[PDB]
RNA sequence: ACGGAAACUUAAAACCGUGUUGCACUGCAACCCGGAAUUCUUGCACGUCG
């Protein structure tokens, strides 16, 4: 390494959940009993034929 | 009344005619617009719930 400078890290072990906000929203996903569907938008146009 | 006295050495005629200060000749040969400079340093997607 250099003389002015060493490394070092740190512990981060969550116990409660992690939200960061970033702007960005989930919209109508599948509000049901037992799944929350999150698909891909991509093959939903893949019938067109 | 002196071998005396009178008389222009005179008239016209172009030193002119033919003739290039001309011909051959690179303003040319050689070179870097080239070397050293962090787009960077301060900064949490969050306050807010009868």
Same mark, same amino acid.
């Given at each position: 390494? =250099?003389? /002015?400078?060493? !490394?070092?890290? +740190?512990? +981060? %072990?969550? +116990? *409660?959940?992690?939200?960061? *906000? =970033? *702007?960005?929203? %989930?919209? !109508?996903?599948? @509000? =049901?009993? =037992?799944?929350? /569907?999150? !698909? &891909?938008?991509? %093959? +939903?146009? @893949? &019938?067109? @034929?």
């Amino acid at each position: 390494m =250099s003389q /002015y400078l060493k !490394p070092f890290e +740190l512990t +981060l %072990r969550c +116990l *409660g959940p992690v939200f960061i *906000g =970033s *702007g960005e929203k %989930r919209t !109508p996903y599948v @509000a =049901s009993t =037992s799944m929350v /569907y999150f !698909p &891909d938008m991509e %093959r +939903l146009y @893949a &019938d067109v @034929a």
